[PDB]
Amino acid sequence: PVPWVEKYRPKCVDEVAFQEEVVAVLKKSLEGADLPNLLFYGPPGTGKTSTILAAARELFGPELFRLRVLELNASDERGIQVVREKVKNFAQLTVSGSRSDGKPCPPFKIVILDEADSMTSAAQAALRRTMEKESKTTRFCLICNYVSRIIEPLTSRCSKFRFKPLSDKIQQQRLLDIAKKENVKISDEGIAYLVKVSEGDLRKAITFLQSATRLTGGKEITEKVITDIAGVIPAEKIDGVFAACQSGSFDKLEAVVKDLIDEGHAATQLVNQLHDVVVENNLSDKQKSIITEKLAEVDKCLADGADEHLQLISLCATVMQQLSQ
Amino acid sequence: VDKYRPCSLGRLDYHKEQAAQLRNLVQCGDFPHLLVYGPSGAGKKTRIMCILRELYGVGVEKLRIEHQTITTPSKKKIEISTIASNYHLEVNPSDAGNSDRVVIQEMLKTVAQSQQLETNSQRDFKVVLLTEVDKLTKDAQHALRRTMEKYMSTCRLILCCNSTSKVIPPIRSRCLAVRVPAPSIEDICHVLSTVCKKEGLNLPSQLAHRLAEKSCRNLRKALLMCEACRVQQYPFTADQEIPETDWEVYLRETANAIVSQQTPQRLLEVRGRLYELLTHCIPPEIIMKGLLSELLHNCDGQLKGEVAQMAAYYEHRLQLGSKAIYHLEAFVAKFMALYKKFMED
Amino acid sequence: NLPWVEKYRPQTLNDLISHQDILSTIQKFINEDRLPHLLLYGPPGTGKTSTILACAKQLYKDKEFGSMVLELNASDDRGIDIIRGPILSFASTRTIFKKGFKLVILDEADAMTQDAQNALRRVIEKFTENTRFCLICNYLSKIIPALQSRCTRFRFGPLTPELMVPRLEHVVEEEKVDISEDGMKALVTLSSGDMRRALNILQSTNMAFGKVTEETVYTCTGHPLKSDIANILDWMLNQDFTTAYRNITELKTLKGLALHDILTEIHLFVHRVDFPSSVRIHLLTKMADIEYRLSVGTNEKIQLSSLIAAFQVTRDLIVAEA
Amino acid sequence: YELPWVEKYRPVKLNEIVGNEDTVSRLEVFAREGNVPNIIIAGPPGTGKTTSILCLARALLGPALKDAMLELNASNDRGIDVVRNKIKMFAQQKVTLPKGRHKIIILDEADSMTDGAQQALRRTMEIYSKTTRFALACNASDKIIEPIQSRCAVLRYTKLTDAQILTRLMNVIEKERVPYTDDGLEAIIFTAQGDMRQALNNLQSTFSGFGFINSENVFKVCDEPHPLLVKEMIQHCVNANIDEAYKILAHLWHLGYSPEDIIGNIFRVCKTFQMAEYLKLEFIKEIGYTHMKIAEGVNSLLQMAGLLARLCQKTM
Amino acid sequence: WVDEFAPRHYTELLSDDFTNRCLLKWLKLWDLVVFGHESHEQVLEEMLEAGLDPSQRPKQKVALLCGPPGLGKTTLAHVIARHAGYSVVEMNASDDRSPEVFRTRIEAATQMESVLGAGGKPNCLVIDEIDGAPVAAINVLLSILNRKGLLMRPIICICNDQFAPSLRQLKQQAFLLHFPPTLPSRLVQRLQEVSLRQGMRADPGVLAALCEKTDNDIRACINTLQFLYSRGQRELSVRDVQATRVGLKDQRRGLFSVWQEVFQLPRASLTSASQRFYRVLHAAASAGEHEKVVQGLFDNFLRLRLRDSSLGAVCVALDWLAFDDLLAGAAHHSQSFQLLRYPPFLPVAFHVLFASSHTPRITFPSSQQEAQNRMSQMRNLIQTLVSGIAPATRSRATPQALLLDALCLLLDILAPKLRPVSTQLYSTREKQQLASLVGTMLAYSLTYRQERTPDGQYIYRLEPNVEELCRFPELPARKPLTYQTKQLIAREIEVEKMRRAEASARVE
Ligand SMILES: Nc1ncnc2c1ncn2[C@@H]1O[C@H](COP(=O)(O)OP(=O)(O)OP(O)(O)=S)[C@@H](O)[C@H]1O
Ligand SMILES: Nc1ncnc2c1ncn2[C@@H]1O[C@H](COP(=O)(O)OP(=O)(O)OP(O)(O)=S)[C@@H](O)[C@H]1O
Ligand SMILES: Nc1ncnc2c1ncn2[C@@H]1O[C@H](COP(=O)(O)OP(=O)(O)OP(O)(O)=S)[C@@H](O)[C@H]1O
Ligand SMILES: Nc1ncnc2c1ncn2[C@@H]1O[C@H](COP(=O)(O)OP(=O)(O)O)[C@@H](O)[C@H]1O
Ligand SMILES: [Mg+2]
Ligand SMILES: [Mg+2]
Ligand SMILES: [Mg+2]
């Protein structure tokens, strides 16, 4: 059991790089022993969960880590009743602040809510009501992707801590450090393409590098294993699709669509990469608008559960209509 | 198609580099949760079989049938036919229309909290092979994600599916995605020549190419077509009547009856034909795919494209309701109104 | 010490405001001993619990409030075991106290199922002369029409800012914090017509920074700024597609915005922008579709591009009409 | 300690029941024939399914009602044990009755029972058919199994028509000497939504509140979205206008109404609007689509604005 | 209500005489142990005569009278047990839920040496509604059947659904009677006999019309006969059977109104479209059942004459039906029951779309119910087929893959061209081809089955009826295998099955 996204979490708050302002404010809040307000938010892979776990480890220590820290996934537990019963069951246990090592521990238990922005308004209203139920003995920490998804009352009893996305130089630095630590043979171009396919995510990059070490088995990691583990459709397929739609008939469209489907490539990856291609190139505003609206409708239909081949042939019909006119 | 399936990854005929990646994955420890996907008939079950062969000894090929009794929130005991063994457990949770979450909770609990018998032979984890996870509901996949989170230590899953857009990203992101493409026409012809030459047959290359092009890159169909062509007439000629599946040519005749006449009595006749197709238990997605392909074979003047969009839209409606005959007849009625408008002007 | 709502909770029929017809009718019924089963429904934080607690402390003393009033709330699951459990046994009993009816305060009565509301309908119709229920709920339409047909309903609406600002001025005169005009405008706009969130936001602004202005409220709450949404709409209406997409995705990854909040603030903005009717219909239909597509849980960049797409078709049509 | 008007003015004979016509005539024939079969009474809630079999039983048994009549609601326990014990016990007692008289066991809300309860109720209805006659008041007759309804008569109750509710309400008004206006009667019809007990309760609520009946006083004690404003919103959506319709929608949204309440009043007004038939059907389809969005969990103001834009887009 | 017209002797039964004769033969077969006295029809007569227990008992001790819940099987068992010299002690399995009181009502109530006060009147056990009993009770009855004290009194179980799983372990040692007592010749003969028993005078044609009217029910026929006797009509004519005129209606004459209210325009102010709109809306709401109305509209809007040659209304009606299906799905999923105010607008839309003065034929919807029944039957066929599949080839393919990719090709593999020649005259290649054929039949577990057609000749079919799945009628007909080839391959299949049994005996 080697979870590299958990193994390479900095357990010390001084080991947290790039966020020393938030580290210093967290250290002041821990030493002040009166912390009613706490919130972490940012893009995934920024290590807000690792930062609050490092704060919990530097305050509670390893002995109280399994006692006064409770982590719950909000997206896994979107039901009302489970987060009513588990939070109350954890909060009702009266554990004093006395530590066997003699360190002064202030008397609160910490609660982590991972992906708390996935809740609805009524779920967060019931959550707030539970916060007002147990605002004394235990303390809470919400982790969300966007702070504007969180309803107002939960922003009243918390202090925000914004996270910048990590710059690609320190992303490549951390990836080469981890590859040197675990003796992983991968070139600089492989690291750059690995951070390209995982757009601003160190969790996805760490899991993809772990899977590359699993699938290569000691070999040098190439571009093919990276572009196949992430499921990335190669740019030759997208260029062939746009060549068929630009100058061709529906026989060519059905040929390239059947080739993509029988190659096993997912339609979600195709709509994402076709959106990425069509939002940057030199088409007209009307053509880009019609194609992107069709891509959004296609991804909605794929989320509903509609058949992918019919959606792809309708999407390629729309792209052919816009391009071949 | 079952006698000469390759038992191990070293005996495969196509996709050698993916076999090398999968045997390197087996070659080390911490084998993660797999999500095997692709098109139907590509060889996903063959790859998963070879993975399970490499994961254990020679006793993987032993299989048995159990009829396990599940209990719903309603007091109702429902039997589920599981294909199990002493090293893994293969299940199809899609047979329960609404109780799929209960069976994927209970089988996960009885496979995880019940420890393995002899831990010297197998590893610390045993495999649960879910089959066709795409038609599971969203709350069922959420319960699957919860049970995967709770029991990572002793139960590491392999999810065989197709068309991964029905699968939610919170369970896709936790699994290593392995994509098995359908083999190329040259590789289908090569394995047809191999399966003919190892039983003393004289299949020419032209009939093999016609078999590969006719089967739409489905390998099981392209091999059962070869065996049916052997049985139908043994001396293989380049011009052979390839044995066509009955519902495919019935769908082609259905599209011919659609393009024949644009009158509502023909719509009633085609409603009878669609009802026959529905009561023959084939899914309406395949019906829409075959109908659209056979209508695009008989269309002209760019109208295909509009028809193509139309087909996708009604398939979308078919994924929101429960009575598929309303949406299928809405599609063919709108298509016949559009043809009448196209052929009139 | 304590939160301001738990300090300054109203305890008198005159201390609750904007419900003067409702409070007058409740006082008229309770002076004549003709009070029916009550169903107070409305938005959160508009004075539903505090009104009936003021009426209970008017009816009963401090000593007998804990005996002839049973309170059930969100901590109690509302299924079928409760209605055949403590509330039935509470309603079907007499008391050694003065000869008056009992009282059951059932918070969040809209979370009961149709079978639970029918069982509660049986309990309500069986015992009337000794028990007067009080069901308080957010949505009237989530309960059955039989339950609406046996208990008298009362709509606790939102508080108009014209009537809301004297209580805010009273709590800013009693508690000395810095008060400006734009801070009060931000309070009465972001609070959305309920006193509970206004007092919570005011206390959080006092405890976090110390002064109450518009930008302090916006930074403490995380609400999207008006100039922020103005910049988003300007980028959608007079920039290129790749330029607008890159600018808005950098603003989303910087400011911490989400596409649902961008959607509702842009929806509030486009009814100020004097569009022609046809492009207004097109924008509203497209934005409602984007809201539903975000509700069903898809990728976010593609829906952002569809929003920019609708506004680019809009800007082409606007310039072509000019 | 005055009784509410729901139970105070409940009718005591079959001649005062205004709901059905053929079924009340069948009950009137059954009250004098004396060979009453086991019956199942089906219909919407609140249409009078248990003030009709009660009147039939009181006209049938008469002075021996208290010994030879058992009403079993869903108010008590609805397990299998109480139906096994109490119903069989009551059917096994003897009552000195005339030739064409039988005991009556009314089972209110007979649809919530399981399959075992009704498959035992088959034998309890079959065996004791000479002594007692059953009367199951069911909300939905499709949930009743086929062998139960094969051996028993099926009686159907419709939803109260607005003319019948008008006749009953004017009878209650003339009985209680209530001054009234026609606009107040229209308002109490609109807030009544076809239910008789809801109509009587709203009328007694506004009579205890304000007294004199007028259309302004009905909506002070009910406070639905006002049908004048909702009808103006539908009229603006049908007259190719989106700005004025959204102005009315924002006026009804800054009064704090939920999306569900506004869209329910939107459909209730669009039922009785005045326009073309195909435009009505397209509007009802769009309103149902938007209500599916709202009940799915999308309850923003943008969804109501998109509904208004789609209604304005249907009418060119 | 069956007061004096109840059957009491063997001459008042309303079933076919073969079923009653074999039932009486099974009842009188127990006289060797109770009293101590010393096609499918031929199969039943062989199993009722050839071979008995050493303790003078039959092989089966329980009769499963499976059929529809009416049709008077209980009264038939009562009068036959009265005729055979026993007394009927009936019991019910629906009021008995606890297994302890079940064993009190079975193992402590009857089938012992219950020598009562009437020494010439022994007793027999009659059980009704055995399908609805819990599985513990039927397991207890199975243990009583398998008790070796010994069971001597007969058990006459009454069944309603034969294909319940709880009777999977019982019918192999039971006696099945799925006979349909719907033969009017016998129903009207016993009806004339029971009319002669009292004095009611009825024509045979009128009672035959009543028999074919109320779906050949008999207890309801006696109930309505006593009802018309209480009304006072001493004679019966065609007008007396026209009091209802439909006996197959479960209040279905209202539905034929409302579909007419959808389809037939009211003939002639009342010509306003708002009045017709409100009228058909009120009728659609007042019809009560909605799913039957929707199915009737879907099955009836194309057989009606349509003037829309451009299909300008069929698309709108199918959109409306999809809207109704979406409403049903959303109201079932979100559990919010304020969405059901809309689907009453489905018929009135049809009344706007298909308002015609003509009155075509309106049919009760049979396409949807038989369609779902066909889907259930084909699904159970697939389940039985894959249960027959050996576990090695079971896991290698999904049921949809075998249904859409393999089954027609499997039928084309398993139907080659052969000649009528003996087994020893085949060549080496032909013997290897027959070995491959019988290996496929052994692995996929199918066997050719003999069937007696109603014409009289013998025909051969598949054992799980795979050709029901993998075939369509509108295709051009392919040449099937001849009869003697089916006989030859069935003989090869059974001798290969015996060879496989010998191989499994030699290995084990
Ligand atoms: N400031 C940092 N210094 C050092 N390592 C960091 C820093 N930020 C992130 N990391 C690394 O990034 C990894 C990912 O951390 P996570 O906490 O999973 O990211 P995240 O923000 O929680 O995204 P989620 O969990 O998917 S919402 C950690 O295990 C660290 O190894
Ligand atoms: N009319 C009012 N006048 C003054 N303060 C008020 C008024 N209504 C609400 N408040 C304040 O807001 C708080 C919330 O009131 P409550 O009635 O307890 O909430 P609610 O109306 O029951 O809504 P819930 O409980 O969240 S569903 C009170 O404790 C007061 O501090
Ligand atoms: N046709 C009618 N004429 C007179 N009063 C009626 C009529 N229909 C209903 N009512 C009144 O409405 C109430 C009837 O409610 P009930 O009959 O108890 O409800 P229900 O319709 O039987 O549905 P259940 O029993 O809850 S399943 C009484 O107050 C009656 O006075
Ligand atoms: N390397 C191979 N050699 C021979 N046959 C193969 C090979 N790979 C796949 N096949 C055949 O292709 C067919 C694919 O079946 P399957 O693995 O079940 O596909 P799917 O899982 O997509 O339904 C099988 O019948 C198998 O016999
Ligand atoms: Mg996280
Ligand atoms: Mg409250
Ligand atoms: Mg009632």
Numbering used by the authors:
A (entry chain D): 37 to 361
B (entry chain E): 5 to 349
C (entry chain C): 19 to 340
D (entry chain B): 34 to 349
E (entry chain A): 282 to 319, 346 to 455, 480 to 599, 624 to 863
Show the paper's wording.
In this cryo-EM study, we reconstituted the human CTF18-RFC–DNA–PCNA complex in vitro and captured seven intermediate states in the PCNA loading cycle by CTF18-RFC, including an apo state of CTF18-RFC before it encounters a clamp, two states of CTF18-RFC bound to PCNA, and four states of CTF18-RFC and PCNA interacting with the 3′-ss/dsDNA junction.
States 2 and 3 represent binary encounters between the loader and the clamp, with the 3S-binding mode (state 2) and the 4S-binding mode (state 3), that differ by having 3 versus 4 clamp loader subunits that bind PCNA. In the binary CTF18-RFC–PCNA complexes, the A-gate between the A′-domain and the AAA+ module of the CTF18 subunit is closed, and the binary complex becomes more compact transitioning from the 3S-binding mode (state 2) to the 4S-binding mode (state 3). RFC2 binds at the intersubunit interface between PCNA-1 and PCNA-2. The interface between the loader and the clamp increases progressively from ~1,600 Å2 [the 3S-binding mode (state 2)] to ~2,400 Å2 [the 4S-binding mode (state 3)] and to ~3,900 Å2 [the 5S-binding mode (state 4)], Therefore, we suggest that the increasing surface area of interaction between Ctf4-RFC-to-PCNA drives PCNA ring opening. In contrast, the CTF18 collar domain only forms 4 H-bonds with RFC3 and no direct interactions with RFC2.
